[PDB]
């Protein structure tokens, strides 16, 4: 007779490209059917890439120009309130200040997922956030979220600046290329390959969230909304007549890409 685990893991992928919001959503899903447990899990891994889209947005003439740049990236999961299913774990579990996050997720047998006596589910979460932090947004049993926010940046060997830096002469110097350059304003922004790659290429989330469902529940079909967000600031530069001066407007634009996914706990499928 069978003395192994009594667990099966079924894994698939849904991928969507949102052209308009420059987002490549790549969701992996893994149903964990531990037949020795009255509940049944689902791990939803949110990867892909949210493009940074660091670009000259506005030009008022030679002497003023604005640059849209990404101040934060967000991923949010949300079950509706009427749904029977619940959130039981998430990864990262807490804020992350290091430049890399990495965790290998295993199943430890009583609706328990950890980051010998373990079932591998085949997920090693990994991402990078040079110059940014990860903040966990107040989780509940129906909602969880991470925001990856800008924190800090050296500019051509000049002192780390951030979103609120101020100098009475040059103002906020975050993406100021030169203090006295005789180019036009649109040409006076820092080359994006001198900053974090999150500003140019963008951010590639790799978060996980574990959802649990009672076997004994007449409705075995759950909806869930997944949101990928990009928040952009407006970094302006103008000529004062003797130099460049920068200003930074926080959170002026928010690009948001939402999708509702359908979970079928009997078929162990998740559809677009």
């Amino acid at each position, epitope marked *: 007779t069978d003395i192994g685990s009594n667990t099966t893991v079924k894994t698939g992928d849904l991928v969507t490209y949102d052209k308009e919001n420059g987002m490549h959503k790549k969701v992996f899903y893994s149903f964990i059917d531990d037949k020795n447990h009255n509940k049944k899990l689902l791990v939803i891994r949110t990867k892909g890439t949210i493009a940074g889209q660091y670009r000259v947005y506005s030009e008022e003439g030679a002497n003023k120009s604005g640059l849209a740049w990404p101040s934060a990236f967000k991923v949010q999961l949300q079950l509706p309130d009427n749904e029977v299913a619940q959130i039981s774990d998430y990864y990262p579990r807490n804020s992350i200040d290091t430049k890399e996050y990495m965790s290998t997720l295993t199943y430890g047998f009583n609706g328990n997922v950890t980051g010998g006596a373990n079932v591998s589910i085949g997920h090693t979460l990994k991402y990078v956030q040079p110059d940014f932090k990860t903040i966990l947004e107040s989780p509940t049993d129906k909602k969880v979220g991470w925001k990856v926010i800008f924190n*800090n940046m050296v500019n051509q060997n000049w*002192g*780390p*600046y*951030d979103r*609120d*830096s*101020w*100098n*009475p*002469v040059y103002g906020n*110097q975050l993406f100021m290329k030169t*203090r006295n350059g005789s180019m036009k304003a649109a040409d006076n922004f820092l080359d994006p390959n001198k900053a974090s790659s999150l500003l140019s290429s963008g951010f590639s989330p790799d978060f996980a969230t574990v959802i649990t469902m009672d076997r004994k529940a007449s409705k075995q079909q759950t909806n869930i909304d997944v949101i990928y967000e990009r928040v952009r600031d407006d970094y302006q530069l103008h000529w*004062t007549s003797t130099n460049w001066k920068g200003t930074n407007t926080k959170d002026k634009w928010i690009d948001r890409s939402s999708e509702r996914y359908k979970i079928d706990w009997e078929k162990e499928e998740m559809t677009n």
Partner: antibody, heavy 122, light 107 residues
């Protein structure tokens, strides 16, 4: 202990020139913006000139073209060359240090000297 | 050429009083405003930066508020050490001090 000591200054005929200096001690001089600020007897503080950590200089219109601020990090000392003085420039002249956060937040003029008096008159 | 006007220019108060000084800029300066205390024949001390943030040494009875054009400094419970002159200073665009406000002793 952090300290700034102004010196130079005294009587000058209107039209004449003069040179203040400031010795700084107890911190890394080269890494702070520095200012001169003046105060005529009985009156308010008036910003006179500033100099950035990279040697870039800043002036209000009241002195522009007449005063020059300078820096000499090797001697931990700040200077003010005052030309074409007038009665209006009569005041006590202080030396002051800016302080910033590690990420470039400006606190303000953090530490001041005791001042040195300049009197411009016939 | 940002003018700063403080008001009132003189105010009298006794210990315990809650005094408020006002500073007005001739154009917007966001929240780039600082406050200094000065006593006779001494050098100024920095009290407040970014219109409401307290400099490290400074007693918590001091506090500040404002944005744009009008700013106030407030001493919640005046002490003997607080009778002095106070100066606001704008740093949105170079530096400008207000003309000063003397807090005198009422009798």
């Amino acid at each position: 202990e952090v300290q700034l000591v102004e010196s130079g200054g005294g009587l000058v005929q209107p039209g004449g020139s003069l040179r203040l200096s400031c010795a700084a001690s107890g911190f890394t001089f080269s890494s702070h913006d520095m200012h001169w600020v003046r105060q005529a007897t009985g009156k308010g503080l008036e910003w006179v000139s500033g100099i950035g950590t990279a040697g870039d200089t800043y002036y209000p219109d009241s002195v522009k073209g007449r005063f020059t601020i300078s820096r000499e990090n090797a001697k931990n000392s700040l200077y003010l060359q005052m030309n074409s003085l007038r009665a209006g420039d009569t005041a006590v002249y202080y030396c002051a240090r800016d302080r910033y956060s590690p990420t470039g937040h400006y606190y303000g003029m953090d530490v001041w000297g005791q001042g040195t008096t300049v009197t411009v008159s016939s | 050429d940002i003018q700063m006007t403080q008001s009132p220019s003189t105010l009298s108060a006794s210990v315990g009083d809650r005094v408020t000084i006002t500073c007005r800029a001739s154009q917007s300066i966001s929240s780039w405003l600082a406050w200094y205390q000065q006593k006779p024949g001494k050098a100024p001390k920095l009290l407040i930066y970014k219109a409401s943030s307290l400099e490290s040494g400074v007693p918590s009875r001091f506090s500040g508020s404002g944005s744009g054009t009008e700013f106030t400094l407030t001493i919640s419970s005046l002490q003997p050490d607080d009778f002095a002159t106070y100066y606001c200073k704008q740093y949105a665009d170079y530096w400008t001090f207000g003309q000063g406000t003397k807090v005198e002793i009422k009798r």
